[PDB]
Design a protein around this ligand. Structure first.
Ligand code: EMC
Lengths: 51, 51
């Protein structure tokens, strides 16, 4: 029953960790996405305004 | 992951410690106690040797 506590610690640990990686992965991809937009959405307004 | 586990795993050794030092008493006193065969002065010698 020590093994029990062990084996599962193992699993949860590595999974919970992967989950973080995944979460952090997303965040960056979100940043990119939004940022990319904010950049164009920005040059654009100036141009429409000019037009 | 590492931290998650090293934390869980550490409490598991702290449990193994006391559970183990116990094994040590139980082994040693079951040994001294075994001096009942030879004289009680034998216990003094035995138990001093042990405890
Ligand atoms: C100039 C529309 Hg994001």
């Amino acid at each position: 029953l020590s093994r029990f506590k062990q084996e599962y610690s193992q699993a949860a640990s590595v999974l919970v960790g992967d989950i973080k990686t995944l979460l952090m992965d997303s965040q960056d991809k979100y940043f990119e996405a939004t940022q990319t937009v904010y950049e164009w959405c920005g040059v654009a307004t100036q141009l429409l305004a000019a037009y | 992951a590492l931290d998650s586990q090293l934390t869980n795993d550490f409490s598991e050794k702290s449990s193994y410690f006391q559970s183990q030092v116990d094994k040590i008493r139980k082994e040693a006193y079951a040994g001294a106690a075994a001096g009942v065969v030879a004289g009680p002065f034998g216990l003094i010698i035995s138990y001093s040797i042990a405890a």
